[PDB]
Amino acid sequence: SMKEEIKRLAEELKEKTKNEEIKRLAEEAAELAERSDDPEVLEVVLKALWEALKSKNEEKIELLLLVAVLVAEAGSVDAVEEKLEIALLALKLAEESKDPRIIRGALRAAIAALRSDDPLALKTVKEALERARASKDERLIRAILAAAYAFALLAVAGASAERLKEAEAIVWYLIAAAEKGASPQELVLLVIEMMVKGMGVTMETHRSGNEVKVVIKGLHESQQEVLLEAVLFAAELMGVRVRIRFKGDTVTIVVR
């Protein structure tokens, strides 16, 4: 079968690269391909897998497998139009930029977005990708994608639709802040403030000595993981170094 080749080439790729990121993505792409009975999606997965085996840049294998996972989630049976729209924006935006951080950020944001069937969430990342498609400011593009991915992580977590409603305004402020020329340090803080507000918890951000120190109490275990994923990805995307220290459900972040 067309899925039989996908399983063979996917399992044959995990025994090649020694990056755990390649292992989880190639396996995830194959698993999504078994649901999709669309032969056109099975062709994109088979072409991306066969082209990723030949390439050995590893980071190119990442971006190639990212397209395989994204085009497979869109090929999921009974896919809403807006889902396919979000993917096209990310696929186009990845082709329209040379920074590998934008190609990864755009693809990963759309992948996490299609995970949740939340219509308020699908529109927040869709309008965000449209705005990044127009501007050429790389920092603005990365901030829009970092906010779209963090917003998607809140929706995948399954927070209240009211909580996501508040988080939407934080995304709008975040995209506007990068439009006004905000620093990369302060934009990450806006990403953090969207997480604490979208999960119904309180914060206590401090600031003294050219180093913002945001402490957050009340976060449960699962909430600290969703915070850690969004804050880390946004930190790597914006390009700033942060420290996320844990101690009895009191996360403390140090940006600089």
């Binding site: 056109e40 072409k47 082209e51 390439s55 190119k60 869109a74 990845a94």
Partner: peptide, 23 residues
């Protein structure tokens, strides 16, 4: 209908980005 349009648009663009990342 338009879902069939965006269906082709996602599949074509995906195969175009794959070729761009390959070279």
């Amino acid at each position: 209908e338009r879902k069939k349009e965006l269906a082709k648009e996602v599949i074509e663009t995906a195969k175009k980005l794959i070729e761009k990342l390959a070279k």
